């Protein structure tokens, strides 16, 4: 049966699979598509890294304001472009 | 820059 390999996991995954992958201090949410290649398909249009983190769709966290002396709470919305949101709490 | 939000990769031919 088909499969793919990950160098940056190291791992062997079937068709189908779904993993996370770390590179470029992002990580990446990919599948494994085979289509006799052992194609893998990656993306990082699902999930928000700010602040050097890496978030999930509806992720929460707080943040400080850079001048003001204040935290703002940011959400990870996605809309397949990595985008999140932010305000003053 | 951030052109594009994915990629692919397979096997190399060699």
């Known amino acids: ?89 | 820059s951030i052109s594009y939000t994915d990629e692919i990769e397979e096997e190399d031919y060699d």
């Open chain 1, 1 to 89: 049966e088909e499969t793919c390999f990950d160098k940056y996991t190291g791992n062997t995954y079937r068709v189908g699979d779904t993993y996370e992958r770390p590179k470029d201090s992002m990580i990446w949410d990919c599948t494994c598509i085979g289509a006799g290649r052992g194609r893998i398909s990656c993306t990082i249009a699902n999930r928000c890294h700010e602040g050097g983190q890496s978030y999930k769709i509806g992720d929460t966290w707080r943040r400080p304001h850079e001048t003001g002396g204040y935290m703002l709470e940011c959400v990870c919305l996605g809309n397949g472009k990595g985008e999140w949101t932010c305000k003053p709490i």
